[PDB]
Amino acid sequence: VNQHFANLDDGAIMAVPPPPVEGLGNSGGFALRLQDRAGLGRDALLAAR
């Protein structure tokens, strides 16, 4: 599915497998929260992002 639709012209499309354990996330892998711990601001937040 990812190979067939890798060249979609209007938007983005992505196929993923379900997470191994229900209730611990939307998918497998890692989930990090980047935190504005110094109040750099939304523009600086998007720059660092």
Binding site: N7, L8, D9, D10, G11, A12
Partner: peptide
């Protein structure tokens, strides 16, 4: 109103997946 002229080839697709100066295949 400004910034375009007749005959210009504008891209109407894949805009989010294209960076300035990148090479593309026109359909």
């Amino acid at each position: 109103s400004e910034g375009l002229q007749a005959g210009d080839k504008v891209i109407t697709s894949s805009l989010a997946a294209i960076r300035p100066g990148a090479k593309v295949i026109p359909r």
